[PDB]
Structure formats: C-alpha cells, structure tokens
Amino acid sequence: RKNTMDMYRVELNDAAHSDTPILCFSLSPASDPRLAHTMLGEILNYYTHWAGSLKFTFLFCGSMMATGKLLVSYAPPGAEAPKSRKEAMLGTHVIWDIGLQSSCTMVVPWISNTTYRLTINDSFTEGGYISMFYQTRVVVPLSTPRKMDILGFVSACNDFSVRLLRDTTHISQEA
Amino acid sequence: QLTLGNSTITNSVVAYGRWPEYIKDSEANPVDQPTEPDVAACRFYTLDTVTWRKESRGWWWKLPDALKDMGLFGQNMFYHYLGRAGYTVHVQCNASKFHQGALGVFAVPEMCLAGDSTTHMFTKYENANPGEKGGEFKGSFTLDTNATNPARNFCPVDYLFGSGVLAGNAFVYPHQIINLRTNNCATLVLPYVNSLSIDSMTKHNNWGIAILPLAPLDFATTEIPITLTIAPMCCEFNGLRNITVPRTQ
Amino acid sequence: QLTLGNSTITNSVVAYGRWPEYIKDSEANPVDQPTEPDVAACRFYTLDTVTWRKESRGWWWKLPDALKDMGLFGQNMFYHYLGRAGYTVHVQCNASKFHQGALGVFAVPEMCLAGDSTTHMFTKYENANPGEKGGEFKGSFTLDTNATNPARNFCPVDYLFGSGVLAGNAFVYPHQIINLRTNNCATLVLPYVNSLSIDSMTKHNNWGIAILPLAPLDFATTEIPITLTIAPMCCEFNGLRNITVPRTQ
Amino acid sequence: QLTLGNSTITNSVVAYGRWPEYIKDSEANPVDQPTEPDVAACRFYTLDTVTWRKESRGWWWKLPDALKDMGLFGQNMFYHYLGRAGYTVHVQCNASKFHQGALGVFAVPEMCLAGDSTTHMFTKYENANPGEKGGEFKGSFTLDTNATNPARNFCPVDYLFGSGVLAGNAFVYPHQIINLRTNNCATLVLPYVNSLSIDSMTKHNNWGIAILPLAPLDFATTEIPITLTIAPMCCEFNGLRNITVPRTQ
Amino acid sequence: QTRHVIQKRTRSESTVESFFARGACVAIIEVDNDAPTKRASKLFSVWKITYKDTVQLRRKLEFFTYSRFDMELTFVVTSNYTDANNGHALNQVYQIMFIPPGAPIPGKWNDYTWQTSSNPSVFYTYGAPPARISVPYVGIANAYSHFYDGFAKVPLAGQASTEGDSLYGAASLNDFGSLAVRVVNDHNPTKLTSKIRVYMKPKHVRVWCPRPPRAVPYYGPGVDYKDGLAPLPEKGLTTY
Ligand SMILES: CCCCCCCCCCCCC/C=C/[C@H](O)[C@H](N)CO
C-alpha cells in the first residue's frame, strides 16, 4: 500500500467483535512515518520544537446502511502501548457512532513534561499512542459491501506553535 | 456528547429524577476526610462486550462489582473501607435497518438474585460478584443437586427477573428500551441509592444492571455485540488502610 | 437552489472565503472598456459526464480551458485578448444507500501537472488544454520513450496529485468531499485567483479541478456517472479583435 | 504534631524556604484536568527501617522512587504519565543519653550518583531505582571489572557524597543534623523542585535523601534503628492511561 | 476534562517573514583568473537569476502559489590557487554586474559591456566581508508566480508544428535577468579559481494560496518528476 492511494485507506469489515486494534501509531507528528508527510508533519520538519493540541478526524466511507461503534484512544506515554481495547479505554478516548456521524474528531490535548517536544523520535519527549478499536462491530444488512474504508486526517489546534527553524530532511539535492 | 474525565461518548433516563451527588455535610456518617479521586476514577470504563444471539436469555452485572478491576476506581474501592458512587451506564448495540429486536435495560437497586439450591441464601461471594463479565439469565430453573461440591451460584430465570417477580413488571425500575428499529444505545444515570449515606463497596452492590431481550434478535438470513460503558460518578471514599484482596474462584 | 442567468441547480465551499468579484477601478490594469456579457456567458454549462468505476484513478479539468467551447462564454474568451472569471463548480454524483465510496474534489490555483518525458516542461498546448473532456490521473508514472513522435502529454500520478506532492495534502487546497453515504454533490465557489487582475484565458488556466477517489467505489454486486456543471462568474473581457483559433490535436 | 490525611507524627527545615504548593494556572504545562488524590495519597508512609552501626557509611533513597509501592500514591504514580509532589521527610533515630553520634540528613535536588564502571552513565534503571530499601554509601570506590555481566550499579563514595563532591560541602543542600545528644528526629519539608512544572515520576527522581554518619555511633559497651517516614505533599497527576509496570531486578 | 492554562506560547517564529528570514544558497558561480589563451579557464560566468538551481529555498517558496517580497543578495567569494609552480597572485577584485533582460550580455571578460554605465555592478574585494545588495519587488505582475499553469504562446491553426510551441509553465513573469561575474584583475602567471556563492533572503514577505510541499525529488524547473517516486517508508498498520 505504501506510496499508493491505498495507503490512505484503512479497511474495516463486519466481522465479529474483537478487542484488537484497527490501527495504531505514535504521537510523533514530525517523525512518525504516518504523520511526518502530512502537511502538519511537513511544517513541523522545518522546526525543532513543537507544542499544542492536535485534531485527529476520521471519516467513515462505507455505505449508508452500515452501522457501528468505534473507540478512538490517546494514551499518554510511559506505559505499554495499548495492545487491546481494555488498555486503550483507560486513556483519553472517544466513542464514534458511524451510523450517526460519518466523521469523528478526537482532540489529543497537549500533555507533556516539557513545554515543547522535539520534532524527532525522542524518548524523553515522546508524545504517546493513538489507537482505534471496534466498540461493538460494523454491521451491514444483506446486499451491502461487507468491507469499507475509513480515512484519517490530522491538523493542529489553535494552541499549536513551533520554534527553532531548521532545514528539513524531506528534500535533498544530489551532485 | 457526554464527557467525564478523559472519556467521551457520542434515550437518556435519570433514575428517579435524581442526579448523582456528593454526601451533604448533614448526611455524612463517617468523620474522616473523604477521598474524591474525581476524573482519575470518575470516567467511562468499557466492559467486555457480550454477544446477543437469537437464543440469548439476558445478561446481568452488579455495580460497583463490575468495575472492581477498572484502574484507579478499582484501586480506590479496594483501598477504602467505605465507598459511594453513582453511575452513568451506556449500553451500546447497533444493527442494520434490516435487523429487528428489542432490549430492556433495567437498573435495579439491591438487585438480589435467586440461588440454585434448596439451601437458602447459599450463593457464595465469588459467584455473586463475577466482575465485569457479569452473568446471564436462564430460560428455566435448574436446581443444583450436587451435594459434595454445590455450585452455590445464582440461577436467575428471565421471566422471573431472576428474583421471583414477573419480568414484565421490571419496568417499575429505572429502565430504557433499545429498539433496534429506533435506537442503538441506552443511557441510564443512576444516583447512589442505599439505606446509608455510604457503605462498603466490596460487601455490598448498590445497583444491578439487567439486560433482557424483550423481542428476540432476528435477521432475514445472526449475532450482534452489546457493549457496556459505565462511568462512576460523584465518587467518595473513606477509611483508608491496606488493600482488600477478596478471595476469588 | 442556485440560479445564474437562465440556469438553475437544485456542502458548499467558497475558496479562501472570497466570493468572485469584478475588477475594482483601483486594480484595473487595462484601460479599454471591459466587456461584461453577464447572463449570456455567466451561466451553468454541463460538461460531458465521466464514469466512476472501481478502477478509476481520478479526473482533472482546467478552467477556463474546460469551458472554451461553451457557447457565448467560449466566444467571448476567444474574441478577447484578456479574460477574467470566477467559477461555481457543481460536481454531481448520486448512488444508492447500498453504494459506498468517496471523492475528493479539489480546486487548485495554477494546477501545473507533471509531464511524461525526460524533457522538462515538454507537454504541448493541445494536450495541456484538453477542453471539457479533461484528463485522468494514473496509478503510476510511465516515462514516454518514443523519441520520433513523443506523446508530449501529462502523466499525472494520483498519489503524487499529478505534480509531485502527496495527494493526502491536497486538502490544503479548497476542496469538498462527496461521501456517497452522506452527500451526492459538491459545490465550490472559486474567485478569480491570479498574480494579475486579468490575464489571457487562452494562454493561462487559472484553476484546475481534480477529482480523486479517496475511497474506491463499491457495491455488493458497478459504475456511477459523475457530472460537472460549471458556471463562470463575474466575467470580464478586454482587448477585442479577430477571433483566436488555437491549434488542435 | 504534624498531621496529613489519616497519619500523625509527634529541628524542622523547609528546603529553600519554599513550602510545597500546587501548580499555578500560569505555570501549568499540561491541559488535561489534573488528578489530586489529596489525603488518600498525601499521607505519611513509613519505609523499612535501616540499622545504624559503628561501621555504617550512609544510606540514600530517591523520591518519588522510594514511595513507588506506597498504596494509592504508588497507584496514582504508575497510572499517570505526569506526576508532581513535594515531601515531608521525617527521619527518626532515638538513643540513650549515653549514646553518641551524629547524622547529616541531606535533601538533594537531582541527586545523581556515580556509577561503578568505566562505561559512563551505565547504571541501569533497576539499580538506580531501588525503591523503599534505598541504597548505601561506600567507604571507597571499587571499579566493577565484570565484563560479561556488569553490575551496572551505583558506587557512591561517602566522602565524595556519591557524586564526586566533598561531603563536607553537602550542607549547601537543605539539611538537618540529628545529634544524638540533642535530638532524635529530623524533619525536612521539600517543595517540588524541577526545571518543569510537572514531569514523569517513573522516569525522573526529583529528590534524593542522603543520610551520612557525621560522627560514628558509639556506646560504652551497638546498633540503633533509623526509620524514614515520608509524606508526599500537594500531589498532582496528569495523563491517565493503563498502568505502567516497570521492569525489575 | 481540561484545566485552566494561561497559555504564553506565541507563533512569532512561524510567521511567513520568519519562515523565510534566512539567506539560502541559490547558486555557485565559478570564474577563473587566468591567461586568456588557455581556453579551459572561464574568465567570466553568466548565471540566470533563479531560485530553482537549489532545492531548499525552492521547496520553502513552493509551499505557496504566489509571493511578493524584496530580495537581499549576499555574495560569498572564495578563491584558491590551482598549481604551486607559477608564482603567486595579488588580491583579486570581482565585478558582479546585474544584466536585466534585454541588456547586452558580455561576450568577453573585457568587452565594452563591463563599463556597466546603466547596469548595477558590485565590485567586491577579496577578503572583504561578503558583498550584499537589496532589490525591491520587481515583478511585472502584482506578485511572483511560483506556478504558472499556462504557456507564453498559444499555437494557432494553420501554423506549422515548430511555430507556436512554448514550454509548459514558462512565462516571462520570472525573467529577472542574469548576473555576469568576472575577475577585474589582469591574470597572474598562475591560474586562480574563484566561486561566488549567491545567497537569497526574501524580506517583507507576503504569500498566497498555500500548496502541499514537494514530496519527490525536483526534476527540472517545472513540476516534472522522474525518480524517487516512493517517499513513504514501510510501517505496519497496527505498529506504534
Ligand atoms: C550590483 C548588481 C547585482 C545586484 C542586483 C541583483 C539583481 C536582482 C534583480 C532580480 C530580482 C530577483 C528576485 C527573485 C526572483 C525569484 O525567482 C522570485 N522572487 C520567485 O518568487
């Protein structure tokens, strides 16, 4: 999927409920590969320091007849990354009813020991974990696609700021 | 959108029209300074999901028993002699427009359940407090005839509401109906209900949650999950000492 | 219900929060009296419908190129040295409640597209200005190796947004999502965007329209049409002379 | 008589003349609602008693590491990403009027200790965080020569104050002397000292407690116990998630 | 739930002014001080003024569609001997003449054009601090165009294939002239080689219509791409 349009689509299906995650990624907006090449990541890679809250929106692109509930969780760092919904539900989280609203926004509030995090993978300024789980399950009637896609979007909130302009690693020139 | 602590959920019944509240100074029995963990414990915890099938008879949980292993709420519960909490119970069950079925979700104060033996009141603590997994109602009553190793478990019959009363009258309790054609969730706000301002959480379950299939699940072809998300509310704890470690199994 | 001239259409995005407007006297470069055909040209024209399939990679059009053969707007465009117009773009794509899929509709100022050859900037005018039929994005980049008769065409790769940028970031442009479960149309109001108050419409395409399948079309069994209806807005023309007749094919 | 929560203790030094305090709104880095367990965690916990002998070189503990297994304070510490607390440290050491000896009790912010190997900064997490048992100073430095299984432990020399500084100058730190002929206890009130308003309690030890025999214990004939009782103060916690379970041994 | 935080962080260093408030190398112009008859030494060099010879400033600028700014040019001049067996040299003086579009381009290192009666010229003495000049916004349009989705010519029906053909995306909107660089000194017995590094700093910057940044290696002055079309690495869907 990488370096194709498929890399933007995360597949849900109508299988029986499980507690295993749908998707997982770390809150390193400048260095986590899923976030580094987003517009936010691109901007952050010109700066050394970043702080502020983030917005993660998820758009459900299944049929109108599909129903389901999902759990979207942010776990601040320092503990084992949530392996299942039982751990993930202990952190910050939102329950998303795809039948009601095709889009769900979870705000990852700024929580950090330091006043700024580095824009590199750094243990001391690690930002935590983001995971998605099935809350109940995706349910479809007959004559309906049993597999659909969700899309993820990330942006910075109004409290976001960056510091220490620097050159990015995302462009290079040979010879 | 209902938010408690770090948890958010996105039809609603306040049991007895009484929102959960803290103990008033005029009703406080204990004299020591109460512990009020607030957001750290007053937050939504999601129980293990159960499966609604055509043959399902029903499910039951006890509060605060179902939350005894829920992070800091469980820690505060087992570290204190006395505990008090209301609850927000959010039952989640979605299906298609082509599914049918209805669930009655009842919050029952002092939800005592019938035993399985000729010996009265013989259900042992381990079985009476199953934790988050809860228990299930049965279609009929089966007397436990094992004399050597009695099961000493509940035998809650569905149409007797597990306690020798007709299930149809359980609507006198605070309740909500999840009718698959109309809604996919039920929200019950339960104040702390007891004959005391505060009690032992480990000894005593203030609330029972009973989910009965009023109309059996059906689909033209089926099983759908039911997920309980419960937030303790207005938590107060008193009597700090070494942690209680209840006997299990 | 949006009406322009004799045309009526019965979710909406104003690009950069700027409604289309006429040139202010303080920004007017040309001195001759502008031509303002108003309703005769400022009206909705419906382009040829395209087909969205499971395998579709995307579509692109250029404005004002896509409207160059649209009645009096096209006549005024080719009869004048200078032209200026905003647009109302209405993408129409309906499906059943049992279909699924999502389209990203992006309006891109100065939507330059990558070529198909090792020679830089080698896409010829005829291919860069396909007219109402527009063009399609490709899954991958195929270098054109024909040296005798080079295609000299765009090779716009979908995930590179046809210009060497990740498609996921194309949302920085004014955009709308058509999610089949939610909506069947997208309306984008584009002001005239350029580094000049007015420019040559035949030389320069002020806007590009890119429609990408963000979620592939699916149906339980499939193809559904997509129809573009574009109305030029606040049209102004200057520099009347004999009609321009661009070389074709 | 000093009372905190349910704990009471019946000469006193406030480190830097700054009483422990909660984070001001103008200094709060995290935005989530903090957890303030108050009495349930802000109470005196008594560590395991150590034995002062004629040959004792000294003892050291790290805060909050020494309290990581102290009931609800430990639970809140391991359940939260961020934690902040001051402390009240009460060192208790009584003897007869016929005993002699003196202890220097020093509270050291960022009490970094020297390693035991030629590899710099090589002390592993398990040894750097011994918990309530703490560690002991040594008379001399012994380089660890085991290459296969290096101890990777501190080697804190007493006269170097465990960090390469003369012990006689450790009085620049907040301190109290327990002179057996004069007093049997020392009370140090430590505000939260750090370069941040709040930090990770599991990663970072804000305070070190070093108890050195300034005058060796003597008795005309001997060993006497030393007991540490530490109450965390003005506790705040942020970033609730699943419990941290640090690797041990 | 959230607490009350009196936020103090500002966005001062992320203003468009601050984001571009740096001198960026846009060209390395090589010249030689040598005997005219060597035929291998370039006694003068002409560089067309552009930000597209390098990538860093180009990518930053192309975050946006339109820009308007004054420019500061800083010239860092380095020189070295090319051999050790032909004596030494006296301190060199360099002429950097701005040739606006239409002005005669020098054909020889010492032709009449270097009189620079109307062209601005900077004479830089070697060892002096890097030369510096400023220019206002000189675009013939109301803003510079980083992307031009059009042609300079429209081919007309009846014209042969050779006629009416112009490069896609090429317009005189970015025709800013050239810099002609020479060493004013007459040659020493030994060859000397110098490089003038041109650093560009936009000032008083205004930008319009943001764009996704370049994600694959640049290929030519346009938006074309040929290589490095797989920038994303591999990562599991459920791997933190
Ligand atoms: C003493 C003569 C040398 C100093 C004069 C240098 C002349 C500079 C005039 C040309 C101005 C170029 C400004 C920058 C060009 C960039 O391509 C555009 N700004 C792109 O946005």
Asked if the C-beta of E240 comes within 8 angstroms of chain D's C-beta atoms, the answer is: no
**Cβ-Cβ contacts under 8 Å, A3 against chain E:** 229-232
In angstroms, the separation between the Cα of residue B95 and the nearest Cα of chain A is: 6
Contact (Cβ atoms closer than 8 angstroms) between residue B51 and residue B213:
no
Give CA–CA dist A97/D174, Å, rounded: 56
Contact (Cβ atoms closer than 8 angstroms) between residue E23 and residue E200:
yes
Give CA–CA dist B231/B3, Å, rounded: 10
Chains D and C touch (3+ CB pairs under 8 A): no
Task: Measure CB to CB from residue C100 to each of A42, A148, A153 and give the nearest one.
Answer: A148
CB distance E120 to ligand 1 below 6 Å: yes
Buried b (16+ CB within 10 A) or exposed e, D23-55: beeeebbbbbbbbbbbbbbbbbbebeebebeee
CB distance E65 to ligand 1 below 6 Å: no
In angstroms, the separation between the Cα of residue E59 and the nearest Cα of chain A is: 8
CA of E173 from ligand 1 middle (Å) equals: 12
Q: Closest Cα to atom 5, ligand 1: which residue? A: E98
Give CA–CA dist A107/A125, Å, rounded: 19
Give CA–CA dist D137/D160, Å, rounded: 10
Torsion sign over Cα E211, E217, E223, E225: negative
- C-alpha distances (whole Å) from C9 to each of B81, C5, C96, C208, E103 are 70, 11, 21, 22, 55
Query: Would the CB atoms of E221 and C121 count as touching at under 8 Å?
Result: yes
Contact (Cβ atoms closer than 8 angstroms) between residue E152 and residue C203:
yes
DSSP one-letter code for B164: T
Contact (Cβ atoms closer than 8 angstroms) between residue D81 and residue D196:
no
In angstroms, the separation between the Cα of residue B197 and the nearest Cα of chain D is: 20
Burial class, D179, CB count within 10 angstroms (exposed 0-12 / middle 13-18 / buried 19+): middle
CB distance E198 to ligand 1 below 6 Å: no
Contact (Cβ atoms closer than 8 angstroms) between residue E176 and residue E188:
no
Determine the atom of ligand 1 nearest the C-alpha atom of E67.
21
Helical pair B71-79 and D71-79, crossing angle rounded to 10 deg:
180
Please name the residues in contact with E106: beta carbons below 8 A apart, sequence gap of 6 or more: E44, E46, E97, E99, E113, E114, E180, E182
Phi-psi region of A132 (alpha: psi -120 to 50; beta: other; left: phi over 0): beta
Given a contact as 3+ CB pairs under 8 Å, which chains touch E? A, B, C, D
- C-alpha distances (whole Å) from E49 to each of A172, C14, E43, E71 are 21, 37, 19, 12
In angstroms, the separation between the Cα of residue B20 and the nearest Cα of chain D is: 20
CB distance E113 to ligand 1 below 6 Å: no
Give CA–CA dist C135/C126, Å, rounded: 12
E residues 197-216 closer than 8 Å to A (CB): 212-215
Chain centroid offset of residue E217 CA: 18
Determine the atom of ligand 1 nearest the C-alpha atom of E174.
17
Determine the atom of ligand 1 nearest the C-alpha atom of E133.
4
Name the helix (H) or strand (E) containing D79. helix D71-79
Using DSSP, state whether C41 is helix, strand or coil: coil
- Torsion, Cα B64 B66 B72 B78, to 10 degrees, reads 60
Both tokens of residue C46? 């419906």
DSSP one-letter code for E142: S
**What resolution in Å is listed for this PDB structure?**
2.1
In angstroms, the separation between the Cα of residue E167 and the nearest Cα of chain B is: 55
**Cβ-Cβ contacts under 8 Å, B226 against chain A:** 136
CB distance E173 to ligand 1 below 6 Å: no
Query: Would the CB atoms of A61 and C214 count as touching at under 8 Å?
Result: yes
Asked if the C-beta of A37 comes within 8 angstroms of chain E's C-beta atoms, the answer is: yes
Nearest to B219 by CA among B55, B96, B56: B96
CB distance E73 to ligand 1 below 6 Å: yes
Q: How are the residues of chain B apportioned to helix, strand and coil, as percentages rounded to the nearest 5? A: 10, 35, 50
Contact (Cβ atoms closer than 8 angstroms) between residue C95 and residue C227:
no
Give CA–CA dist C104/B186, Å, rounded: 36
CA of E71 from ligand 1 middle (Å) equals: 6
**Cβ-Cβ contacts under 8 Å, A71 against chain B:** 46
CA atoms lying within 13 Å on the CB side of residue A43:
24
Task: Measure CB to CB from residue A141 to each of B97, B225, B227 and give the nearest one.
Answer: B97
Q: How are the residues of chain C apportioned to helix, strand and coil, as percentages rounded to the nearest 5? A: 10, 40, 50
Query: Would the CB atoms of A2 and E234 count as touching at under 8 Å?
Result: yes
Chains B and D touch (3+ CB pairs under 8 A): yes
Give CA–CA dist E45/D190, Å, rounded: 71
Using DSSP, state whether B16 is helix, strand or coil: helix
Please name the residues in contact with A18: beta carbons below 8 A apart, sequence gap of 6 or more: A134
Given a contact as 3+ CB pairs under 8 Å, which chains touch D? A, B, E
Asked if the C-beta of D31 comes within 8 angstroms of chain A's C-beta atoms, the answer is: yes
Contact (Cβ atoms closer than 8 angstroms) between residue D214 and residue D52:
no
**Cβ-Cβ contacts under 8 Å, B245 against chain D:** none
Nearest to B92 by CA among A92, A90, A17: A17
- C-alpha distances (whole Å) from B78 to each of B64, B133, B240, B244, C228 are 11, 19, 9, 5, 65
Contact (Cβ atoms closer than 8 angstroms) between residue B20 and residue B192:
yes
Give CA–CA dist B84/B42, Å, rounded: 12
Q: How was this model experimentally determined? A: cryo-EM
Name the helix (H) or strand (E) containing D75. helix D71-79
Alpha helical stretches, state H, C99-216? 125-128
Give CA–CA dist E155/E168, Å, rounded: 12
Please, which residues bridge with residue B209 across strands? B61, B107
Query: Would the CB atoms of A102 and C171 count as touching at under 8 Å?
Result: no
CB distance E178 to ligand 1 below 6 Å: no
Size of interface C-E (CB pairs under 8 A): 143
Query: Would the CB atoms of B224 and A137 count as touching at under 8 Å?
Result: yes
Nearest to C210 by CA among C127, C110, C125, C94: C110
**Cβ-Cβ contacts under 8 Å, E2 against chain B:** none
Name the helix (H) or strand (E) containing E57. helix E56-62
Asked if the C-beta of E224 comes within 8 angstroms of chain C's C-beta atoms, the answer is: yes
Question: Angle at the Cα of D224 (from D219 to D227), degrees rounded to 5?
Answer: 150
Using DSSP, state whether A13 is helix, strand or coil: strand
Phi-psi region of B142 (alpha: psi -120 to 50; beta: other; left: phi over 0): beta
Please choose from E61, E135, E146, E178 the residue to mutate so as to test ligand 1's pocket, defined by most ligand atoms within 8 A of CB. Answer: E135
Task: Measure CB to CB from residue E59 to each of A2, A26, A171 and give the nearest one.
Answer: A171
- C-alpha distances (whole Å) from E10 to each of A120, A163, B237, C204 are 21, 9, 43, 40
Which position has the token pair 């929560």?
D5
CA of E134 from ligand 1 middle (Å) equals: 9
Query: Would the CB atoms of E148 and C112 count as touching at under 8 Å?
Result: yes
Give CA–CA dist A86/B47, Å, rounded: 8
